[PDB]
Amino acid sequence: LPPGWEKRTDPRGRFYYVDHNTRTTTWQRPTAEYVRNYEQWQSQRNQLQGAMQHFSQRFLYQRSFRWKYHQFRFLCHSNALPSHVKISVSRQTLFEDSFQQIMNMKPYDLRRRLYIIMIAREWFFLLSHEVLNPMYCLFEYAGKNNYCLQINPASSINPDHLTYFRFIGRFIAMALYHGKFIDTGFTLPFYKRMLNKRPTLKDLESIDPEFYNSIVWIKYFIQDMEILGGGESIRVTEENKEEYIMLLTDWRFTRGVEEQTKAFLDGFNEVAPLEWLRYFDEKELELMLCGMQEIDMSDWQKSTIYRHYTKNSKQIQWFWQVVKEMDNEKRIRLLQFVTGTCRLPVGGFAELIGSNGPQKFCIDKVGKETWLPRSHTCFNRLDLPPYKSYEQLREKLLYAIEE
């Protein structure tokens, strides 16, 4: 064990670890992996300072979603409660204080006019990041460099992880109720669950490109149903491929994280009934939580790369015309369809990241002219088929993204 750390024993007999050089505690043994991630994550907590000014520039509007969002904001401004709710925090204790104080209260009191003390937009922004602190063990990423947030299947290392997921639940819901934007980085598959929708095989590509490609070719227990080339070892045949893919796809989305997800929803619902989101889809829901940014086309255009196309190619030229005709909401919806998210990083389109590292936006000539445009989220890649009439593309583009 490295200098500064000790292995203490809580009065219930469980073992945790104290880092005396950073006055921190964690339930996890200090791997060289942990000191790596904690050191890195804290280096990113420092830069959070300046990025709050950029965050301020996120916005929503002052059946469509402009519609649906006013209907929602009304359902909240009506079920609201009188008075105020007071939270007090200090900068080295945003998480510890927030956590203990919000779980103390009955969930409805979180629907009063929240008064943070030490600033609300700062608080939701900061706390939305403080909960990814590796100290707590709740999350892991799926790609290099913080790309694809996921519940950590080994969260149980932290004996209290279900309570923490309930607090995040409560916290995400307060944001929706009181109308503030967060920055945690949940994926669309996670919003789909908040809406009782079933993640599909296409969604897997956002989360596990390699695993998705396996299911693409030729289409339980520690991964039941036997393949070569309930049932402890029932062979996968062409006369039961369909059910294998369906059972195994669901498995990849739920495995290891079923308790943690329930506790998240349980926490969300207490504060804002999950059925208040009946109207919304997964992309519209990420919009509310995250907020819209204004997409500027000149930035997008210099930073987009091409494959088999060129700046002056025929359909690549019609693509950007449909964009200029598009309004910012449709622009963001195009953004989500292709990158997986409505969140554009601080640098601009020049700095969007991907599964395997940095990855600018990419439009590729692929597919027959009878196809819709496809995307590959993990590569931020758009497949625009070689279309023949500009209005044909217009139809197929605006259809591919509105589904």
Numbering used by the authors: 332 to 393, 493 to 548, 559 to 659, 671 to 680, 690 to 863
How is this structure described in the published paper?
The Nedd4 family E3s have nine members in humans (WWP1/2, Nedd4/4 L, Smurf1/2, NEDL1/2, and Itch), which share a common N-terminal domain architecture comprised of a C2 domain and 2–4 WW domains that are responsible for subcellular localization and substrate recognition, respectively. Each HECT-type E3 contains a characteristic HECT domain at its C terminus, which catalyzes the transfer of ubiquitin from E2 to itself and then to the specific substrate. The HECT domain adopts a bilobal structure, in which the E2-binding N-lobe is connected by a flexible hinge loop to the catalytic C-lobe. To prevent excessive ubiquitination of targets and self-destruction by autoubiquitination, HECT-type E3s normally adopt an inactive state characterized by intra- or inter-molecular interaction.
Importantly, key residues involved in the WW2L-HECT interaction (e.g., Met627 in WWP1) are highly conserved in all three proteins. We noticed that Tyr543, the key residue responsible for binding to WW4 in WWP1, is conserved in WWP2 and Itch, which suggests the possibility that the multi-lock autoinhibition mode of WWP1 may be conserved in WWP2 and Itch as well. The GST pull-down experiments further validated this assumption. Although WW2L and LWW34 could interact with HECT, the entire WW region exhibited the strongest binding. In sharp contrast, WW1, WW2, WW34, or L alone could not form a stable complex with HECT. Moreover, when WW in WWP2 robustly interacted with HECT (WT), the Y491AHECT (corresponding to Tyr543 in WWP1) and M575EHECT (corresponding to Met627 in WWP1) mutations, which were predicted to impair packing in WW4-HECT and WW2-HECT, respectively, significantly weakened the interaction between WW and HECT in WWP2, and the Y491A, M575E double mutation completely eliminated the interaction. Accordingly, the W358AWW2 (corresponding to Trp409 in WWP1) and H465AWW4 (corresponding to His517 in WWP1) mutations, which were predicted to impair the packing of WW2-HECT and WW4-HECT, respectively, significantly weakened the interaction between WW and HECT in WWP2, and the W358, H465A double mutation completely disrupted the interaction. Finally, both the Y491A and M575E mutations in WWP2 12L34HECT resulted in elevated ligase activity compared to that of the WT, possibly due to the impaired intramolecular interaction.
